[PDB]
Design an enzyme around this catalytic site. Structure first.
Site, short mmCIF file in Angstrom:
data_model
loop_
_atom_site.label_atom_id
_atom_site.label_comp_id
_atom_site.label_asym_id
_atom_site.label_seq_id
_atom_site.Cartn_x
_atom_site.Cartn_y
_atom_site.Cartn_z
CB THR D 1 -0.84 -0.06 1.28
OG1 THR D 1 -1.99 -0.90 1.26
CG2 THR D 1 -1.38 1.33 1.62
C1 LIG Z 1 0.34 -2.65 -0.06
C2 LIG Z 1 -1.05 -3.22 0.51
C3 LIG Z 1 -2.03 -3.19 -0.84
O1 LIG Z 1 -0.62 -4.30 0.63
C4 LIG Z 1 -1.69 -2.49 1.53
O2 LIG Z 1 -0.80 -2.60 2.71
C5 LIG Z 1 -3.13 -2.84 1.89
C6 LIG Z 1 -3.88 -1.86 2.86
C7 LIG Z 1 -5.42 -1.88 2.88
C8 LIG Z 1 -6.02 -2.85 1.85
C9 LIG Z 1 -7.55 -2.84 2.00
C10 LIG Z 1 -8.01 -1.90 2.73
C11 LIG Z 1 -7.35 -1.14 3.72
C12 LIG Z 1 -6.03 -1.09 3.65
N1 LIG Z 1 -2.95 -4.17 2.45
C13 LIG Z 1 -3.55 -5.04 1.59
O3 LIG Z 1 -3.97 -5.35 0.42
C14 LIG Z 1 -3.54 -6.51 2.38
C15 LIG Z 1 -2.13 -7.11 2.27
C16 LIG Z 1 -1.66 -7.85 3.38
C17 LIG Z 1 -2.25 -9.18 3.36
C18 LIG Z 1 -2.12 -9.97 4.61
C19 LIG Z 1 -1.14 -9.51 5.46
O4 LIG Z 1 -1.14 -10.35 6.60
C20 LIG Z 1 -0.32 -10.25 7.53
C21 LIG Z 1 -0.72 -8.29 5.53
C22 LIG Z 1 -0.95 -7.44 4.45
N2 LIG Z 1 -4.63 -7.50 1.82
C23 LIG Z 1 -5.44 -8.23 2.35
O5 LIG Z 1 -5.49 -8.04 3.69
C24 LIG Z 1 -6.39 -9.16 1.64
C25 LIG Z 1 -7.92 -8.55 1.58
N3 LIG Z 1 -6.35 -10.35 2.42
C26 LIG Z 1 -5.60 -11.39 2.16
O6 LIG Z 1 -4.79 -11.37 1.25
C27 LIG Z 1 -5.87 -12.77 3.14
N4 LIG Z 1 -4.80 -12.81 4.14
C28 LIG Z 1 -3.48 -13.53 3.36
C29 LIG Z 1 -2.56 -13.62 4.25
O7 LIG Z 1 -3.04 -14.21 5.56
C30 LIG Z 1 -4.17 -13.51 6.11
C31 LIG Z 1 -5.42 -13.49 5.11
#
Ligand SMILES: *C[C@@](C)(O)[C@](*)(O)[C@H](Cc1ccccc1)NC(=O)[C@H](Cc1ccc(OC)cc1)NC(=O)[C@H](C)NC(=O)CN1CCOCC1
Ligand SMILES: *C[C@@](C)(O)[C@](*)(O)[C@H](Cc1ccccc1)NC(=O)[C@H](Cc1ccc(OC)cc1)NC(=O)[C@H](C)NC(=O)CN1CCOCC1
Ligand SMILES: *C[C@@](C)(O)[C@](*)(O)[C@H](Cc1ccccc1)NC(=O)[C@H](Cc1ccc(OC)cc1)NC(=O)[C@H](C)NC(=O)CN1CCOCC1
Ligand SMILES: [Mg+2]
Ligand SMILES: [Mg+2]
Ligand SMILES: [Mg+2]
Ligand SMILES: [Mg+2]
Lengths: 233, 222, 204, 196, 212, 195, 226, 195, 233
Positions: D1
């Protein structure tokens, strides 16, 4: 055994009535870093074949040199090198498939997925895939990586079976390819806007288009989306 | 870590009659949850009235077929164009497979043709080269769905003569080519319904004394 | 180690015309050792039939649990539980053990006594309902049963035809599985008679 | 992000990209990562989407209850409530949150709360995977007491570069402007910011 | 698999089942687990199907080369030792083989050698080999005497494999039976357990564990 | 605790249970009775993990003896075996399960039948004409499939057991030091002293 | 699974395929993945089948009780809030991935929710193994100001992409349309593009083919009188 | 191959070697001779991994018999034991070592003394009045420390061995199926047939 | 059990004739990233004690709040809170040592190394260390992290034993501390140029110096060093 370092994402392709189209973006990723922005992953061989390559870029550059040397070697003691004994798409493919499978069988793969697109001597369209495992297959549409998941469904709406190929023009096929590349730019985190596209036609020969861009993108609806649920402002 | 194996799905089926044999396979090729192709042939005319399929990991399957085809070519060169009998092919294929005993070809192999009395023959292999002649075999992903049906409908297993209490088995008959193609088509429709890696198309190779004929049928594409 | 294939066993159910059939094998083993040739996997609570495959201690435990629950149901409601309601009760009961599940493949069969409608259902080990019009399969030879059922089955079979079809599905599936067989039982269920038949099958 | 919050003469501005990833797949390309916890206290979210939502919902609840009892909470107070949740549950959370707010007394403020649950008050802050690529750029180009139009440009150019180099960042650039005037939501599409 | 070989007054009895497995999948009910090396020599197969077929077929070739070179039939001792020395070269590579080499020569008399893929080679009068060996041993050892008739010994060998076919999940199909004498081996038929079980139950009054 | 066998004949149940107790490299005892009387017409043999076996057996014994006093009545073998099964099925999902396998031999005075139940540590229960736990069953089940008839006398049952013990003494790698044999019939439980 | 949600002029539409799988085997060819939470709040389900059924039934039950308690028609944001808090508490172990949609007094709504408890808003969404095939179609053909008829077409097209191109998805297309001012219409088996062809042969056996050892009548009745 | 013992008395060496051959759950043989004559006055007993034992013993036998023919002369027990040790010491650093332990009992005709060498699979050699490989030594070494005297007769040596075998039959968990006993003295090697 | 995220490097300290000196740089590292450049890691408690903290910064901020609350609580119902019943260095230390050891004993440590420097009521110098394991020790010089390896050898050349403390002036001690901080900037990859320094003297009280810089650095010899061996130019 290794792991891929600098990588290229999808290569997408399809047959149409008189030929084949193939495309790939111009990015060399380094994990999540979008490191190199002018990488050509479509490599023409003669005027009848384009080899589209995804996966490890160092191994791609090795394959590039194998192909360049194959052309040199086919010209040796061959007065018909620019005619009946020119390299065919099928010859180039079988060579690469042989190498890929030998390399996987020695536990030292070339970490790539490859599509060989072209037109044979007799005018037949050629489109076949090979990867790091030596697995090979052919289909009216072919795509590597994310392309398999998102491009193929779109391209198959145009050419769903062998009988649809004579019904499909170069205009329709190129539009489907260009649309598929936009969808991949929307949805693949290791894609880029800039790409190259090549058409190998049985009448007009090889057309190679560089520096294409994804255009006519819908982002406008974004301004209306607020929060993740209950947040109104 | 690099994994040198993959699973390309599909299923194959060999049945032998009195003066013919069939080898059938679906034309779908997959990795994981993607379709690679809806029509990638898996069953091959190898020469000398022998058909062959090596189903599982398609790269190993193609390598094996390629080597057996080449084996047939050199058998001709070295033994005065002599016809390779189906029993001799089978033994040769055992040696091809067992050569890679400690780095196996990840396939289930079936060959079909005619024996030296003109009777239909199906030979069936495990990945490292053990083999058996049978009337009947399914291999590949949906083998577990299809084999028991073939045991019932080809070899009449668990079927008794009505009204004999349960003491006279249904007697074994050879089936006609028309009856066999019906069992093949139903076997594959059933497997397509219930197995995600089976579908798209069915290609049947029929072997008689007159040669190798092909039939093709659509299967469900979901 | 894998609890769903220590003991072995299979259950299949089919609908016909104004009838249902449910069948099971009789084996109970400890991996390669066959121990018992009489271990039935089909139980009934009034007119609702339950087949259970999987870990045999859980088969027994769940039978005793559903006998308990349906006995109390009957006392409070002043009527026998119907198959649609019992199906929901199985699902509830399996899902309440979501993170320490019973290692079982239950199958419900019966005829709704009010509407006369034939009914079968299957479940996974945590209670997802599979309500099928044609057939339900469960156990170590489930792949084999799916193949037999998908080819042999046709709709609206008469009780005495359905019997042949379900029995041939079971027998031939069992013969391609090391941990199933050793005998079989087939219940044919019509609105107000239930015939139970033990099949002659290969004892290896 | 890629997320940042920047204090300036009239207040503070928050900026973010709109990409949500599921491995290499982009689950949402028009995500809203700037979330309101109070009228003039907002936060940027990075890390786990589930974790940062759960935290932000709890903070919104705590501050609404603060408001009922004690009046408008300070930006420092909001940051303290984020910190308490992030610090005490550090073993179970992956949350990198920037808190930004406007008081009339304190003007614009920015607090960053990285992984461990420490708090750091700063003139501007950057966070998320894409922020690594702009530490150099942001340090060289940030001044205090910039105008609104200057700060909008600083953020637009900064997140432009983060988006260019980070595959996990992309889509639109969203901003929230926090001054005495009120709350202004801005959006900037790829065709504007890429050609910078 | 269940295989057995035993020595008695009237020669050697050899009995094997016909099942092949791929885990809990029944790969076959009709496999041949005896190799007829020559008219006086038999080999039994248990373990890896490919390992057994390949190396025992190979063993037959090496026995044939012995009689071309030496103008004389190979001894049971020497034949079993070719196989045991072979598998010993492969030790640790993961070959899976349990075999009995059974035969007659003038110099030796009727002889049985057990040979396995860890390199064990044993001369003996009675062996049962495979996943079902203990089931076969139970019946065989209970009724064995040196001086059974040829008819009773054939039946005991057949009955012992049936016992294993019943109780062992990884044995079954049919019983292939051999008798080895002064004059060589004699085949005594394939006996499908589908019919053999019920026949034996009725005639013998055994298998009272079963619903019959 | 290695070998425990049970066979049910016309009018009695016979349990045979090995005498060896072994830890590592040493046979500590050669006269161990791996059995508890639960009620005057019900006997339970047991094998499994050191400590767990006796603790479980004695716990069950305490509970059945308690039931006996409270009702002035003997539970049927079927009832005792169901109680035991439930205890093992409850145990298998605990923090630390009882790793104990059992045979229950009883004479039901109400039905005038002998009964033999085989129960493993998971709570897997079966009524059988003959049973065994552990490796013994790999030899004995096939033996008894051949030699057992349902209408045998008690003395025929003992000879049939001699045949089992002989086979185990021939083919098993462990020296289990013979067996203690007990007969459960209409007159109660008695130990055969010479075997 | 392929599930989608599409916003249109006066409402929202959700669609799903009807395949459930157990390993590579198809367990059920005609499941219902469109779960009713309340009369005008429906969701499409992907992930662990039992978890999706249990989670929608629990939240639906509590939404009904909340609706009775407040004398108000339930809101989609309440279904969403309860689902997210429940799923978050179980840290992804309850494997429900849901597209949550409906109409309420506030208007029409479309959300997605993941197993770990993150939620999203959108005009078009897809989840499950076929979500990439579906999203390719949605990204190519979606526009703002869609009619009801155009949205049903787009949604079912997106499911079809999943059905044909994803091995996890197949059989039929289910739709539910939630329009402002109107009853929600649930269109069970809206499309049926995979009917099994006629079999070549009937396998009905001669009566007596199967060998039987014993018969008996089973007593199903209660204990009788007289 | 579990128990092998050796004791050296005044004028002979006695080797006792168990008869059982066991794979997994079954005793395959109960009459196995775990010994090879290397020369007319030298006997080697052996135990260890299946296959390795016989292959090693026969290999050593072939080599000593070859030496005998080439020189028309019998190597001393000391010389044979040094040769064997070197082969095991070479083996231990190979790709796949011989996992074989041995006792070598010989009568040296030049010195008119019996000799007993204990050698393990690593090439660890010791000359001893009595020796054992495997778990047997945990019982037998202390037994012989008590009962052994250096000037015993051959028949006293055999009784001393009966005492060892009795203790192993009492205390060891495995049924090793008795022992084959062989005596090496000035007149060569002979087998005691009743033990 | 956790792992430290944002971290502070060395804290160094020594006794001199009339008091104690303690110093620490102003950096909060985030792995190899030098993330935060104005972090105070010396925290005064009253006018007689400074607690110097290295390791995890989130846990440091927790300890900061524990100390602030300890001062508040000691003032309660205590008319001598600014006199005879003021908090002593030894009271503050024992409190922290108690907490550190309790936390390690529950397998949930505060991931820090702490030096408590001060002057007692009777004029005695106090200098004692405690860390995440609850290990405690005192010495004329004390340092955490890299400081233990590089600062202590330098500081011990000045105060090698108890008898050297009356011989050491505040000028000599401060110079040694300031020199040690330069050496750490040369040699510790997670150090910074900017630091804070505090002196607690029995006569002049607490002097707290912020925004010090490492100065008078030798880099000039660098221009003469070429290649790694044989390279002349
Ligand atoms: C750089 C980026 C795009 O990653 C940024 O930090 C995003 C912030 C964000 C996104 C949506 C709403 C608000 C804020 N984060 C994400 O896109 C996250 C990345 C991420 C996933 C998992 C972990 O685990 C420690 C850290 C960062 N994406 C997600 O959370 C997505 C929706 N879910 C998953 O990928 C499922 N996860 C996978 C890993 O195990 C936990 C479940
Ligand atoms: C009781 C039984 C069935 O196991 C008995 O031993 C069979 C004897 C036999 C002899 C000749 C022909 C056919 C069968 N053996 C088998 O059925 C074996 C069992 C077995 C499987 C795997 C291994 O692995 C070391 C050992 C024994 N079955 C097979 O060999 C089957 C048909 N094939 C495979 O399992 C294929 N794999 C491939 C990888 O390499 C090992 C063999
Ligand atoms: C395309 C697909 C099949 O994945 C889609 O998501 C299905 C959605 C669905 C929703 C409501 C009703 C029916 C179907 N999902 C399934 O069919 C799931 C797929 C699945 C299997 C396994 C896991 O494991 C983490 C996740 C998803 N199938 C099932 O849930 C089946 C019925 N049950 C099992 O496979 C056994 N379960 C698996 C999960 O762990 C508990 C035991
Ligand atoms: Mg299909
Ligand atoms: Mg079976
Ligand atoms: Mg069997
Ligand atoms: Mg980007």
């Amino acid at each position: 055994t290794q792991q891929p370092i600098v990588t290229g994402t999808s290569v997408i392709s399809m047959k149409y009535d008189n030929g084949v189209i193939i495309a790939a973006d111009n990015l060399g990723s380094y994990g999540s870093l979008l490191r190199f922005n002018g990488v050509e992953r479509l490599i023409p061989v003669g005027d009848n074949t384009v080899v589209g390559i995804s996966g490890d870029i160092s191994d791609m550059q090795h394959i590039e040199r194998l192909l360049k040397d194959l052309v040199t070697e086919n010209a040796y003691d061959n007065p018909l090198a620019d005619a009946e004994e020119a390299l065919e798409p099928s010859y180039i493919f079988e060579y690469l498939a042989t190498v890929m499978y030998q390399r996987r069988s020695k536990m030292n793969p070339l970490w790539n997925a490859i599509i060989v697109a072209g037109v044979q001597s007799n005018g037949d369209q050629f489109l076949r895939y090979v990867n790091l495992l030596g697995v090979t297959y052919s289909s009216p549409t072919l795509a590597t990586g994310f392309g398999a998941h998102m491009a193929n469904p779109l391209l198959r709406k145009v050419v769903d079976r062998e009988s649809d190929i004579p019904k499909t023009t170069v205009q329709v096929a190129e539009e489907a390819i260009v649309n598929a590349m936009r969808v991949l730019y929307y949805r693949d985190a290791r894609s880029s806007r800039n790409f190259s596209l090549a058409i190998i036609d049985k009448n007009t020969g090889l057309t190679f288009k560089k520096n294409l861009q994804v255009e006519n993108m819908k982002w406008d609806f974004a301004k209306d989306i607020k929060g993740y649920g209950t947040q109104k402002i | 870590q690099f994994n040198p194996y993959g699973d390309n799905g599909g299923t194959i089926l060999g049945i032998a009659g009195e003066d013919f044999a069939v080898l059938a396979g679906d034309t779908r090729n997959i990795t994981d949850y993607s379709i690679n192709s809806r029509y990638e042939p898996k069953v091959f005319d190898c020469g000398d009235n022998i058909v062959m399929s090596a189903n599982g990991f398609a790269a190993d399957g193609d390598a094996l077929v390629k080597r057996f085809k080449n084996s047939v070519k050199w058998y001709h060169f070295d033994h005065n164009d002599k016809k390779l009998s189906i029993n001799s092919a089978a033994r040769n294929i055992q040696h091809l497979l067992y050569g890679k005993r400690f780095f196996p070809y990840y396939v289930h192999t079936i060959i079909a043709g005619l024996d030296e009395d003109g009777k239909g023959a199906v030979y069936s292999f495990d990945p490292v080269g053990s083999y058996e002649r049978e009337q009947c075999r399914a291999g590949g992903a949906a083998a577990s769905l299809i084999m028991p049906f073939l045991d019932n409908q080809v070899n009449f297993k668990n079927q008794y003569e009505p009204g004999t209490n349960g003491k006279v088995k249904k007697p074994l008959k050879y089936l006609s080519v028309e009856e066999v193609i019906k069992l093949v088509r139903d076997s594959f429709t059933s497997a397509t319904e219930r197995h995600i890696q089976v579908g798209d198309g069915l290609e049947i190779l029929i072997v008689t004394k007159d040669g190798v004929r092909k039939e093709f049928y659509e299967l469900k594409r979901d | 180690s894998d609890p769903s294939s220590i003991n072995g066993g299979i259950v299949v159910a089919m609908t016909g015309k104004d009838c249902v059939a449910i069948a099971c094998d009789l084996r109970l083993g400890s991996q390669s050792l066959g121990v018992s040739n009489k271990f039935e996997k089909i139980f009934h609570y009034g007119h609702v039939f339950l087949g259970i495959t999987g870990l045999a201690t859980d088969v027994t435990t769940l039978n005793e649990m559903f006998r308990y629950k349906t006995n109390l149901y009957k006392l409070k409601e002043e009527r026998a539980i119907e198959p649609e309601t019992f199906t929901q009760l199985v699902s509830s009961s399996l899902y309440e053990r979501r993170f320490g599940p019973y290692f079982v493949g239950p199958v419900v069969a019966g005829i709704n006594s009010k509407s006369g409608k034939p009914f079968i259902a299957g479940f996974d080990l945590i209670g997802c309902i599979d309500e099928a019009k044609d057939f339900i399969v469960s156990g170590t030879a489930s792949d084999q049963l799916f193949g037999m059922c998908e080819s042999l089955y046709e709709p609206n079979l008469e009780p005495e035809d359905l019997f042949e079809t379900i029995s041939q599905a079971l027998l031939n599936a069992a013969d391609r599985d090391a941990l199933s067989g050793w005998g079989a039982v087939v219940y044919i269920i019509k609105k107000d008679e239930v015939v139970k038949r033990y099949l002659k099958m290969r004892q290896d | 992000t890629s997320i940042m919050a920047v204090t300036f003469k009239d207040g503070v501005i928050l900026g973010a990209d709109s990409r949500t990833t599921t491995g290499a797949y982009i689950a949402n390309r028009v995500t809203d990562k700037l979330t309101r916890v109070h009228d003039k206290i907002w936060c940027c979210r990075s890390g786990s989407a589930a974790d940062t939502q759960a935290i932000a919902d709890i903070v919104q609840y705590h501050l609404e209850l603060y408001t009922s009892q004690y009046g408008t909470p300070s930006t420092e107070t909001a940051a303290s409530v984020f910190k308490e949740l992030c610090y005490e549950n550090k073993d179970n959370l992956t949350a990198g949150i920037i808190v930004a707010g406007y008081d009339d007394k304190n003007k614009g403020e920015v607090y960053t709360i990285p992984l461990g649950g420490s708090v750091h008050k700063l003139p501007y802050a950057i966070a998320g995977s894409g922020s690594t690529f702009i530490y150099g750029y942001c340090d060289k180009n940030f001044r205090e007491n910039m105008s609104k139009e200057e700060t909008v440009d600083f953020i637009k150019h900064s997140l432009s570069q983060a988006i260019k180099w980070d595959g996990s960042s992309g889509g639109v650039i969203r901003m929230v402007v926090l001054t005495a005037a009120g709350v202004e939501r801005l959006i900037f599409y790829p065709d504007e910011y890429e050609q910078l | 698999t269940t295989t057995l070989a035993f020595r008695f007054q009237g020669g050697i009895i050899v009995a094997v089942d016909s099942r092949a497995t791929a885990g809990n999948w029944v790969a076959s009910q009709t496999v041949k687990k005896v190799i007829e090396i020559n008219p006086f020599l038999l080999g039994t197969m248990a373990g890896g199907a490919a390992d057994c077929q390949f190396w025992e077929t190979w063993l037959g070739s090496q026995c044939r080369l012995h009689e071309l070179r030496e103008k004389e039939r190979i001894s049971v001792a020497a034949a079993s030792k070719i196989l045991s020395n072979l598998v010993y070269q492969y030790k640790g590579a993961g070959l899976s083989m349990g075999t009995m080499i059974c035969g007659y020569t003038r110099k030796e008399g009727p002889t049985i050698y057990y040979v396995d893929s860890d390199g064990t080679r044993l001369k003996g009068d009675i062996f049962c080999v495979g996943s079902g060996q203990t089931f076969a041993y139970g019946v065989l050892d209970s009724n064995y005497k040196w001086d059974l008739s040829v008819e009773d010994a054939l039946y005991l060998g057949k009955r012992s494999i049936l016992a294993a076919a019943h109780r062992d999940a990884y044995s079954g199909g049919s019983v292939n039976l051999y008798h080895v004498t002064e004059d060589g081996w004699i085949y005594h038929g394939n006996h499908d357990v589908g019919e053999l079980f019920w026949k034996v139950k009725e005639e013998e009054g055994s298998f009272n564990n079963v619903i019959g | 605790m290695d070998i425990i066998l049970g066979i049910r004949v016309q009018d009695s149940v016979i349990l045979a249970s090995s005498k060896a107790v072994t830890r590592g490299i040493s046979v500590l005892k050669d006269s161990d009775d791996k059995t508890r009387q639960l009620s005057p017409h019900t006997l339970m043999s047991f094998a499994g993990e050191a400590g767990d076996t006796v603790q479980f057996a004695e716990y069950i014994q305490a509970n059945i003896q308690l039931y006996s006093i409270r009702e002035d009545y003997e539970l049927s073998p079927q009832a005792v075996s169901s109680f035991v099964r439930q205890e093992l099925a409850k145990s298998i999902r605990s923090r630390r399960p009882y790793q104990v396998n059992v045979l229950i031999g009883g004479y039901d005075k109400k039905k005038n039948k002998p009964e033999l139940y085989q129960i493993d540590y998971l709570g897997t229960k079966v009524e059988l004409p003959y049973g065994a736990h552990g490796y013994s069953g790999f030899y004995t089940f096939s033996l008894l499939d051949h030699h057992y008839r349902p209408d045998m006398t008690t003395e025929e049952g003992l000879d049939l057991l001699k045949l089992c013990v002989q086979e185990l003494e021939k083919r098993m790698p462990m020296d289990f030091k013979g067996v203690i044999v007990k007969i459960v019939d209409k007159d109660g439980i008695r130990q055969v002293d010479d075997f | 699974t392929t599930i989608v949600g599409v916003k249109f002029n006066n409402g929202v539409v959700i669609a799903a395929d009807t395949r459930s799988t157990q390993g590579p085997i198809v367990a059920d060819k005609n499941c219902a993945k469109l779960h009713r939470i309340s009369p005008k709040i429906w969701c499409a389900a992907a992930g662990t089948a039992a978890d999706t059924e249990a989670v929608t039934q629990l939240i639906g039950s509590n939404i009904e009780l909340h609706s009775l308690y407040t004398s108000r028609e339930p809101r989609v944001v309440s279904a969403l809030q309860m689902l997210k808090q429940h799923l978050f508490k179980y840290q992804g172990h309850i494997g429900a991935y849901l597209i949550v949609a409906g109409v309420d007094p506030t208007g029409s709504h479309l959300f997605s929710i993941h197993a770990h408890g993150s939620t999203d808003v959108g005009y078009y969404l897809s989840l499950g193994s076929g979500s990439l095939a579906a999203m390719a179609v949605l990204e190519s053909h979606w526009k703002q100001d869609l009619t009801k008829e155009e949205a049903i077409k787009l949604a079912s097209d997106a499911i079809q992409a999943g059905i044909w191109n994803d091995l996890g998805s197949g059989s039929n297309v289910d739709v539910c349309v939630m329009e402002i001012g109107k009853d929600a219409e649930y269109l069970r088996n809206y499309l049926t593009p995979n009917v099994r062809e006629e079999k070549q042969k009937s396998y009905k056996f001669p009566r007596g083919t199967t060998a039987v050892l014993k018969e008996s009548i089973v007593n199903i009745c209660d204990i009788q009188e007289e």
